Structure formats: structure tokens, C-alpha cells
């Protein structure tokens, strides 16, 4: 049992990590963060910023979630991110990922008390 806020950190938070030198970054991280258990998570984003920085996003621009929920927030500044995309050669339990890096604004859904990220919505 984990809270939504804990699940978000496990799946999307890697403050000190870096993928720019490691093409196998996603392969390691998706496996380590328990996102290849039972099924290969098709796509996932890791954020390389301090946890407190990502949490501060909930106090920034309010926008609409992709599913039309209204509790989504866009980061004021572009953040360092690594995208992981499952390759079409994958067949569970073999999960091979393509690793890409960007600096882009993120959109997260915030919930509960304290008001923290519980869902990664998009990068813009």
C-alpha cells in the first residue's frame, strides 16, 4: 500500500538522476521503480528536479487535465525530464525502452492534504 503521492515519486521523481550519458537509463529505471512488473509500462516520464521543486508546481498555473479534471498545474519554468518509450520489439517479461531527454514544462494533477502531485499528466 502506497499513497498516490508516494506512487508519483516512485514513477516520476529522480532528482539526482541523469540519462544523457546512459542510453540504458530507462531500462534500469523502469525495472528498478517497479514499472515492468506484470506488464511493461508503455510510456513514462522521469523528472530530474528537487522534489520540493516539483511539489511547488501545485502552487503555479492552473490548467485543465487531459481527462477534463480541473486540478492540473503547469510548471512556470521548463524542467529537466527523461522520457521512456517502450520499444516495439518488447514482449513481457522483456521490456526494452528508448531513452530521450528534454527540458519542458510539466503538467501534474495535485490532490489531498498536503497538496502534492498524485499524477503526471503531460509535458508541453
Amino acid at each position: 500500500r502506497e499513497s498516490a503521492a508516494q506512487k508519483f515519486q516512485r514513477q516520476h521523481m529522480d532528482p539526482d538522476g541523469s540519462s544523457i550519458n546512459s542510453p540504458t537509463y530507462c531500462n534500469q529505471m523502469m525495472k528498478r521503480r517497479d514499472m515492468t512488473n506484470g506488464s511493461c509500462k508503455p510510456v513514462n516520464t522521469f523528472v530530474h528536479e528537487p522534489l520540493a521543486d516539483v511539489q511547488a508546481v501545485c502552487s503555479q498555473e492552473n490548467v485543465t487535465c487531459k481527462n477534463r479534471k480541473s486540478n492540473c498545474y503547469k510548471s512556470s519554468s521548463a524542467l529537466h525530464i527523461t522520457d521512456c518509450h517502450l520499444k516495439g520489439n518488447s514482449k513481457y517479461p522483456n521490456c526494452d525502452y528508448k531513452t530521450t531527454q528534454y527540458q519542458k514544462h510539466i503538467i501534474v494533477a495535485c490532490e489531498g492534504n498536503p497538496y502534492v502531485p498524485v499524477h503526471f499528466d503531460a509535458t508541453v
Binding site: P42, G88, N89
Partner: protein, 457 residues
């Protein structure tokens, strides 16, 4: 028989020293993604040197570097070493540390499986490797050199190896830019080889349609070929056409055919359907990331319904399929008694397409066991139809609906069906679907009612 298997752990000096006596005694030692470094390779070398029972050693995904890798191979040169399977995948091996390979491969006459994937040895490192592989005492059954920074100049040395070996069963050179001429040299080496090759993987190797007559020749020459992976190569329809005659030979017993992202369209899919209808041996086929379109899908479905087709798994993720193709899959899900897995993610099916599929699956006599419908633009309005399937279907064990447009309301409709203990589904996959804490509570309540039910997110 003694086996140790560590996956994804931070081995502290404490936890580490514990294992040394084991590494000196055990038959099987796997230390994968364990944060090992060169600081630990002398322990490994010493341990292994004194281990006459060791047959498998895997150290994949550890930052050993050239020094670390060097130390490990050094310890594997005792006349006592009995090793059969060795993996140094993703261990930071560069050309700089390959000078030891020729010596190691000469002495390790028991070695059958060698994994060097994800090491940037390059062509210079590969040549040193082949100097070892060339040694008469080096008789591998399996060689994996995926993503090792190799180019066309590595093909001649590799081909020269294949010509004189007879024990090769599996060869993977995927994700190396061998180029058209390099691939021709490799094929020639395979043709001239007496090896009864069982598996050949050359994903993303710069293979073109021009290479496909040679690959056809390769297939024809290896009646033992069970798996062929030519994914992520620009083969095109013409390439497939040049390939199919070999697949159609009576001696061909191909089991798995992987053609992910090969610039194939409808007519190329047509060529392959000829193979589906004639080769009962073909059990797994991937055409993911090819623009087959609805016409392509129509052809597959008609072939799947032919008596000659016994396909078990079909991978067609990201194939530009729309709701218009779904009536044809319905006939398949209803009639085909061989298809157990159907991956249709990342196709713009919509609620319409998925509702159609639900019509066929809402019968209790289907055989489909796994269905992926992720990123198919499924909304809340398609979930009630899926809910009905979960009630009425008696074969579906896994359903993937990740990355769709649905939300809590949709998900709640699915959970309601799963409340029934008679439901056949064992695993529901819902990655990147956002629902509120309220739905989660209903979700975790169900999980505790039915512990055998796996809901993945």
C-alpha cells in the same frame, strides 16, 4: 545444485562479503544490476578462480569498466574453470579492455553462451573478440552483441567466424549499423556455415530491400531456423516480397517472425498472409509500427481464418487501424481457435472500434487470453461495453487499457464487473489513467475482496 540470483540491489560491503563463499561454491551466480564496480572484481576473480562447479556467471548492468572486466576474465582462465554461460552485458567494456578477450576465449573451452550486449567495444574491440572467437577451442552456441557500436568493417571478421564454426544456435547483432554491404557479407557467412542456426536477430542494422534476397537465401539454408527478427529495418513491401519465397519452403519451420517497423504496408502484409496460410509452424508474428491500415488488417483476419493458419500471438500495435477493421477482428475472435494474444494498442479504434470487439468477446466460447487496447482513444462511453465483456467472457485473462481517454467513471464501471467472483479476468492494466482518491478506495476494496485479481498501475 546451488544457485544465487540477485536482481536490482545495492550490495553493501556487508551484504557483499556474505556472498564470496557462495560465489566460490555455487553452480549458478547471477548478480545483475547490483551496483558492482571494479572495486569488487578482484573478489569475483579470486572467488571464481577457486570454483570448479561454476557453470553460469552473469554480471549484467554493473559499472565494471575495462579494469573490472579485465580482472573478471583473468580469473576465468584456470584450467579448472567449467563456465558455460557468461554475461558481461552493459558492463562498460570498451575497445580499451578487449585486448584480454583473445586469451580468455582460447582457454574457456566450456563456454557456450556469451553476452556482450550494450558494451561500446566498437570495431576495434570486435576484431579482438573475433581473434578469440576464431580460436579452434572457442565453440559458442549463443553470441549476443546487441548495441556494441559495430559497423560494416566488423562483418567480415564475424562472417569469417561463422564459416568455420558449426555449433552456433543463436546470433544477435541488433542495433549495430552494419549497413547494406556489411549485411551482405554476414549473410554470405551464414549461408556458407554448417551451423544449424535456430535464432537470428538483426534489428536496426541498416538492412534494406537489397539485402532481402540474401536473407531469403539464409532462411532457405537453415531448416532449423525458429526465430527471425528483422525489425527496425527499411525492408518495404519489395523487401518482404523477396523474403517470402524462403519462408514458404516446405523445410521452413519458422516459429517466430518479428517485423516491427519495417516500412511495410498493405501489399507487404498481403505477401506475409500467404505465409500465414501455408505455415502452421508460425506461432508469433509482429507487424507493429507498420502502416498496414484497415486493408492490411482485413487481409490478416481473412488469413487467420484459414485452416492452414495456427497463429497464436499477433503484435499489431501502432498500425494505423481504425474502427472499420474491427468487424474483421470480430470474426477472428469468434472463429479462430489458435489466437490467444492480440496486441492492438496505439490504434485509433475509438469507442466504436472497441464496442465492436466487445460484441464478439461478450460470448462465452472465445479463446483469446490476452488483449492489449492501450492508447486506442477509449473513453468512459466504451467502458460499459468492456464491463459486459468482463461479465460474459470466459477466456480473457488479461486486458490492457493503459493511456486511454477514460477516467474514474469509466474505471468504476469495470470494477463493478470484477466484483463478481466468477469473472475470468486475472489482470487489468491501467497505466497513466487518472482517477481520484474516491475511485482508488473502491479499487483497493475490490483488491482485498479478490486477492487473485491483479490491477496494475
Amino acid at each position: 545444485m546451488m544457485s544465487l540470483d540477485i536482481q536490482c540491489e545495492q550490495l553493501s560491503d556487508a551484504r557483499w562479503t556474505e556472498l564470496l563463499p557462495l560465489i566460490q561454491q555455487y553452480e549458478v551466480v547471477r548478480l545483475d544490476d547490483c551496483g558492482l564496480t571494479e572495486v569488487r572484481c578482484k573478489d569475483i576473480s579470486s572467488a571464481v578462480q577457486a570454483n570448479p562447479a561454476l557453470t553460469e556467471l552473469s554480471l549484467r548492468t554493473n559499472e565494471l569498466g575495462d579494469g573490472g572486466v579485465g580482472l573478471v576474465l583473468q580469473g576465468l582462465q584456470n584450467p579448472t574453470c567449467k563456465i558455460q554461460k557468461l554475461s558481461l552485458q552493459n558492463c562498460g567494456l570498451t575497445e580499451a579492455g578487449c585486448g584480454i578477450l583473445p586469451g580468455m576465449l582460447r582457454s574457456l573451452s566450456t563456454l557456450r553462451e556469451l553476452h556482450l550486449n550494450d558494451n561500446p567495444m566498437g570495431d576495434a574491440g570486435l576484431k579482438l573478440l573475433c581473434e578469440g572467437l576464431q580460436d579452434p577451442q572457442c565453440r559458442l552456441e549463443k553470441l549476443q552483441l546487441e548495441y556494441c557500436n559495430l559497423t560494416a568493417t566488423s562483418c567480415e571478421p564475424l562472417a569469417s567466424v561463422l564459416r568455420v564454426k558449426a555449433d552456433f544456435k543463436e546470433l544477435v547483432l541488433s542495433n549495430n549499423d552494419l549497413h547494406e554491404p556489411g549485411v551482405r557479407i554476414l549473410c554470405q557467412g551464414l549461408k556458407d556455415s554448417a551451423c544449424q542456426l535456430e535464432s537470428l536477430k538483426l534489428e536496426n542494422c541498416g538492412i534494406t530491400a537489397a539485402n532481402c534476397k540474401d536473407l531469403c537465401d539464409v532462411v532457405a539454408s537453415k531448416a532449423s531456423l525458429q526465430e527471425l527478427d528483422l525489425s527496425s529495418n527499411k525492408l518495404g513491401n519489395a523487401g518482404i516480397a523477396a523474403l517470402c519465397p524462403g519462408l514458404l519452403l516446405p523445410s521452413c519451420k519458422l516459429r517466430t517472425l518479428w517485423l516491427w517497423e519495417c516500412d511495410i504496408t498493405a501489399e507487404g502484409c498481403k505477401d506475409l498472409c500467404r505465409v500465414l496460410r501455408a505455415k502452421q509452424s508460425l506461432k508469433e508474428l509482429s507487424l507493429a509500427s507498420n502502416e498496414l491500415k484497415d486493408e492490411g488488417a482485413r487481409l490478416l483476419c481473412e488469413s487467420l481464418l484459414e485452416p492452414g493458419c495456427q497463429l497464436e500471438s499477433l503484435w499489431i500495435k501502432t498500425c494505423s487501424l481504425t474502427a472499420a477493421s474491427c468487424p474483421y477482428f470480430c470474426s477472428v475472435l469468434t472463429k479462430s481457435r489458435s489466437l490467444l494474444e492480440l496486441q492492438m494498442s496505439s490504434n485509433p479504434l475509438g469507442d466504436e472500434g472497441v464496442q465492436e470487439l466487445c460484441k464478439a468477446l461478450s460470448q462465452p466460447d472465445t479463446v483469446l487470453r490476452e488483449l492489449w487496447l492501450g492508447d486506442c482513444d477509449v473513453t468512459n462511453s466504451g467502458c460499459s461495453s468492456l464491463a459486459n465483456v468482463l461479465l460474459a467472457n470466459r477466456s480473457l485473462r488479461e486486458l490492457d487499457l493503459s493511456n486511454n481517454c477514460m477516467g474514474g467513471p469509466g474505471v468504476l464501471q469495470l470494477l463493478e464487473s470484477l466484483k463478481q467472483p466468477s469473472c475470468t479476468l486475472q489482470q487489468l492494466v491501467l497505466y497513466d489513467i487518472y482517477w481520484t482518491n474516491e475511485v482508488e478506495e473502491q479499487l483497493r476494496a475490490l483488491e482485498e475482496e479478490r486477492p487473485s485479481l491483479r490491477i496494475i498501475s
